[PDB]
Structure formats: C-alpha cells, structure tokens
Design a protein around this nucleic acid. Structure first.
Ligand SMILES: [Ca+2]
Ligand SMILES: [Ca+2]
Ligand SMILES: [Ca+2]
Ligand SMILES: [Ca+2]
Ligand SMILES: [Ca+2]
Ligand SMILES: [Ca+2]
Ligand SMILES: [Ca+2]
Ligand SMILES: [Cl-]
Ligand SMILES: [K+]
Lengths: 98, 103, 86, 98, 83
DNA sequence: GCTTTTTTTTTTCACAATCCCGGTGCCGAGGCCGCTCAATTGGTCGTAGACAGCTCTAGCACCGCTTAAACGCACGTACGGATTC
DNA sequence: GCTTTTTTTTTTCACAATCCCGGTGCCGAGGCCGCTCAATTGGTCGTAGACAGCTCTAGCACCGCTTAAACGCACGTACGGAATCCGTACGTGCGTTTAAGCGGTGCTAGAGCTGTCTACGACCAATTGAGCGGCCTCGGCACCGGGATTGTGAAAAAAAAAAGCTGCA
C-alpha cells in the first residue's frame, strides 16, 4: 500500500493553491457569517451580492497574507509548524493588536 | 458670541471659516462647525484633564510633553486614536519584557 | 418579516478552508490551536469592516449595504480593494 | 573589587532611559548626517534649527519603536540578544522592506 | 581616518541607548551597522520628500513644516513642530 | 545508614537610586499693552435636497436532487522541545 | 589499528500526480447603433499670483574654554546554538455523513429616479472686539549638597538533595 511522506502533500496543496485564485472559503457559510455579524450593528439589512463577494475577497486576502507573516514567524523560531503565538507576534508587529 | 451660544471655549466662528476655505465641500451647514468645535473641545479636555493629573502626580504645576505622552499611552482609547502619532519629548512607557527580568 | 435571525456560522469556516488559506500563504505544517485562533482573527476583521460599511449605509439612509459601502470601508482600514467599483 | 554580572547594568540603563525623554543621539553628528544626506537631493541647502530637531525626534522615535519589535522577535526565537535577522523580520512584517 | 562618512558619527553608545529606551538587554555586535543602514534609509526617504517640498516652495531653506508634511506622507505623523 | 558531592537555599554586605532636608538664580510662562483683521450682521438671491410618489431591479426565500467536500477515526513518522554541553 | 554494525548512499522498478493536446460548447468580449448630455467654442470680467523692491530674521562661520561622552583594552560570565534524545501531535488515507451548490421558482422591499418647492447657506458691505505680536515680571523649576532610606544584587555561607559506597540479614 503506497503512502506519501508527511509534508509531500502539504507541499503539493501549497503549489496547487498558489497557482490558483478562486476563493477558498465555502461561499454560503461565509455569507451566513457576514449576515450574522452585521445584525450586531443593524437589523433587517440587505447586502448586494457584489458587497458580499467584495467582503470574501478582502477577507481571504487579509488572512492569506497574515499566514505568510505567520509562517516567517514560525521559521524565525526554527520551527515549521505555525502556532498561535506566531500569528500573535505577526499581528503585534503589524500593530493590529496591543 | 457663537462659541458662547454653543457652550464652548473653541471658536465656532474660526472653525466655520477653515471648513469653507479648506476644500472639504462647496457648502457648509450651520451645524457642522458647532458640532466640530464641540468634539475638538471634548477631546482636548480629556487629554488635559489626564495630563494635568500626570503633572500633579509628579508634584509639577506645568504640563510637559511627558505628561501628555503618559496621559495618552495609558488610555486604551486615546492610544488607538494616536497610535501612528509621535509626541516630541514624550518618551516611552516604562516597561521591561518579563523573560529579561532576573530569576 | 418571513424569518431571518442567524445561527452560529463561525464553524462554517471549516478546518479544511483555514488549511487551504494557510496553504496559499505557503504554510507547510499547522498546529491544532491555529483554527480557533484564526476564526477569532477573521471575526474581528469582519466585525470592523462591516461596522464601517454598515455606517456608510446608515448615513445614505439605505437598508442595503452596497459593494461601495464595503469598498469605502476597506480603504478606511488601509485595505484598498480593486474590482468592485470606486 | 565590586563587579555587577552581565545584563545587570543593561537593566539599570533600560529603566533609566525609559524614565527619560531626552534625545539619545549626539545633536551635532546627527546634524552633519542630515546635511550629508540632504546634498544627494539638492546643493547649498539651509535648514531651520527646528527642522533638524523635527528630523531627530522622528528618527529616534522610529529606531526606539523598531528596537521594541526587534526585541520581541528575538524573545520569539527563545533568545535574549537582538540580532540583524530580528530587525529584518520586524521590518519585513511592518511592510518596510519586501 | 575621521573623514566624511557622517553616518559613522552615530556612535555605538548612542545606538545602545536607543535600544535601551526600547527595552533591549543584550545587543549583538553586528547590529550597530544594521541600525546604521536602517537609519539612513529612514532619513533618505523623509528628507527626499521634505526637500521635494522645499524645491516646490521655491526656497533654499528646509523648514520644520517641510519635514512635518514629509513625515505625515511617510505615515510617521509628528506632533509639536507646527502640525 | 553513611559519607561525599553537586545543587539549592539562605544570610549578609555593597552600592546604586530615591527622598528628605537645607539652598540659589535663570528664563520663559503668563499676562498686560496697543493695533488690526477676521468674525459678525442683516440684507438678497439661487438652488440643494427634503419629500413624496413612481418604477422595476435585484435581493431574499424555498425546493429537491447530485456529488463534492467535510467529517472522524486508525496509523506512524518527523517534528517540537527538553536537556546537555 | 580492528572487527562488527549502524549510518548514509545508491540503484531498480511501481504508481501516482501533473502535464499537454485536441474536441466540444457556451457565453461574454467586442462592437455596432442610435441618441444624449457633457466637452467644446467664443465670449466676458475679475482677480490670483508673478514680479521688483526693500526689511530684517535667523542661519552660518568662527573661536576658545570645560567637561561629559566616546574610546580602547582586560577580562570572564552568561549566552547562543550544536548535538542528543524521547513522546506524540500532526499529516495521510480511508469509509461515512453532510450540505454546498446548482438551477429554478415566486414575491416584493427598497434602490433609485422624478418633479416640486422653500429653507438655508453663499454673497456682499460696514463695523469693531476678539485675538494677534510685542514686550516685561516674577516664581516654577533645574540644579545644588548632606545624609537617611530603600531598592537591587553579588558574594559567601548554610542547608538540602543527589551521588556513590557500603555492611548486614
Ligand atoms: Ca526645595
Ligand atoms: Ca468576438
Ligand atoms: Ca467512519
Ligand atoms: Ca432634483
Ligand atoms: Ca430644505
Ligand atoms: Ca503672548
Ligand atoms: Ca508668573
Ligand atoms: Cl448643519
Ligand atoms: K479635499
């Protein structure tokens, strides 16, 4: 029974997704999450579909790029597994977070 | 006077002129510079009230840049407003990362 | 008005999808503790971006958030976005 | 023969400088740098005194701030000593250099 | 020696003092040059803009405003010189 | 149990730094002076935008089948991290 | 300097994954059309700013003292990081469950457009005190020394906890 070495598929995924541009979050789950959060601020709101798409474009990009910063932060501490503290440093140096 | 009408020290007149002139819009409502004076006045007072405390807490009568820096950096909200601002002669908040302290 | 109150949709942002985003960021190995932490971050992004869009809406008196509402809001957060007007 | 252990004056010096507000770079050398660098964009330039001090408040401010972020990276790599790769990472993450 | 690389006028002692005020304890030797590099890029960027202001205003004297306006553009807003 | 080492802990002494007294003198905050222009005013005119009414876009709900993806568990390797030096 | 294994390297096939083509089909890039409203023409009038001339501000050069800071060197402690070692968190793959997505269907809130009318804000001329710069004063605050007090640590001394050896039962 054939079995790929841990990392060899992660590395493939890494190349698969860098080559592409389609959105990586499931479009309805995300849409439900937009609407849920928006209630906090105002009820019985409609969203243009383009406004929701504009939000999932702006989100995915923000995280995808935070994950870059975060990966350097893992590697800086001679690791390969990104950990919570990695994100938190990335965000503290970005100044998103006290 | 207008500032007197609005309950304000800040000059509702002067403010109104800076808006027409200052390339913000073609026309300026009669409310805007009243409101705008009030908000500038509010924020001014919160810093001075906090920095005037920092002076007295250092037995000093005159407020200095350090007193403002201390007032401002210790107030979660004022810090965020002035997060990308530098106060000349403010200095920085005493703080030493824990893993550096002895034992 | 014909049923609209929302559930708990943050778990909709599945571990598969967070893993795919990390993949696009060139991340090879991911700790157990990332996925929940990521949702916190994502939530706080969205809360901030929608608050501001929702403001721009409430000002123009609309009950419909436009793409421009979201665009104007994103430029405000220093996250300028291209290809939805403006 | 009294001898304080490594790092124990450091901490004194930290406590000391964090308590104070006074420029830490010598003012004349700084100024001679500001004119050296100004030449490369225009010759026979004069400066207001306060222009140089505006430049020097701004510089130290940036440097101090960068050192905080540098320290944080160095502590993130389970280290106590800042090194260039700390500065360079904190600048990579600030979006200052690619 | 002692000749016309004014950047070196930025002494180790002064670089040490900054990183102190920035809560730094133990300082690698390589750092005082890295710092020197970084400081220059900082000034280059700010001064280029400040003098770009100067040349536009048709003057030979760099004002403190010119710097203030430059520092705003670089996102390093500075209070207490004419803001 | 014993003795014999490292390690850990406690106790004692040295030294900066702070705060309390005593002081002096410099320099700029503060406030008054004397002039000036920018704020105020009532008048006149034009159109911005409130409003109300009308159109019809597009946003929201609902369904049922298809199948791609998420899900959860078994399995073991290479990673993280502790320790040493 | 060996003899005996582990460690690292090599070579040989099996297998999955990705790659590249032509074929096929759908739809949106591209473009033509006809009508509109915004860019252009040609005119007028008023003032923003270019320009010359003069004022005096503050930037520069220089010099000669007095330190405080930079400097260079001796010395060693605590640090960075290399090397080892061990447990399991993570990746890979499977069978099972889920609901996203799809395309269609039916309803209407509300986005957005129109026309109407007036409340309001820009414009003006006349007046005038609020706030400007200039300048004088007087006490806050920097800096002084003496000595007590309190953090802040380093060393040296005591205690304890491991390291190694035992002397019977
Ligand atoms: Ca006294
Ligand atoms: Ca075509
Ligand atoms: Ca199963
Ligand atoms: Ca209209
Ligand atoms: Ca009206
Ligand atoms: Ca005055
Ligand atoms: Ca006084
Ligand atoms: Cl108004
Ligand atoms: K503008």
């Amino acid at each position: 029974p054939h079995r790929y070495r841990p990392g060899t598929v992660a590395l493939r995924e890494i190349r698969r997704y860098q080559k592409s541009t389609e959105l990586l979050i499931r479009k309805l789950p995300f849409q439900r999450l937009v609407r849920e959060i928006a209630q906090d601020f105002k009820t019985d709101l409609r969203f243009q579909s383009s406004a929701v798409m504009a939000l999932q474009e702006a989100c995915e990009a923000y995280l995808v790029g935070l994950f870059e910063d975060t990966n350097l932060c893992a590697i800086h501490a001679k690791r390969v597994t990104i950990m919570p503290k990695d994100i938190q440093l990335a965000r503290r140096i970005r100044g998103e977070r006290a | 006077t207008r500032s007197s009408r609005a309950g304000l020290q800040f000059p509702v007149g002067r403010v109104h002129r800076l808006l027409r002139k200052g390339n913000y819009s073609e026309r300026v409502g009669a409310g805007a510079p009243v409101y705008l004076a009030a908000v500038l006045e509010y924020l001014t007072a919160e810093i001075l009230e906090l920095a005037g405390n920092a002076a007295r807490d250092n037995k000093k009568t005159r407020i200095i840049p350090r007193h403002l820096q201390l007032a401002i950096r210790n107030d979660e909200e004022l810090n965020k407003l002035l997060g990308r601002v530098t106060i000349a002669q403010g200095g920085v908040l005493p703080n030493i990362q824990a893993v550096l302290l002895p034992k | 008005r014909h049923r609209k109150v929302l559930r708990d949709n943050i778990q909709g942002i599945t571990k598969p999808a967070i893993r795919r985003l990390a993949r696009r960021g060139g991340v090879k190995r991911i700790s157990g503790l990332i996925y929940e932490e990521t949702r916190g971050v994502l939530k706080v992004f969205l809360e901030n971006v929608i608050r501001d869009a929702v403001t721009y809406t409430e000002h123009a008196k609309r009950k419909t958030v436009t793409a421009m509402d979201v665009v104007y809001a994103l430029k405000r957060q220093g996250r300028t976005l291209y290809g939805f007007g403006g």
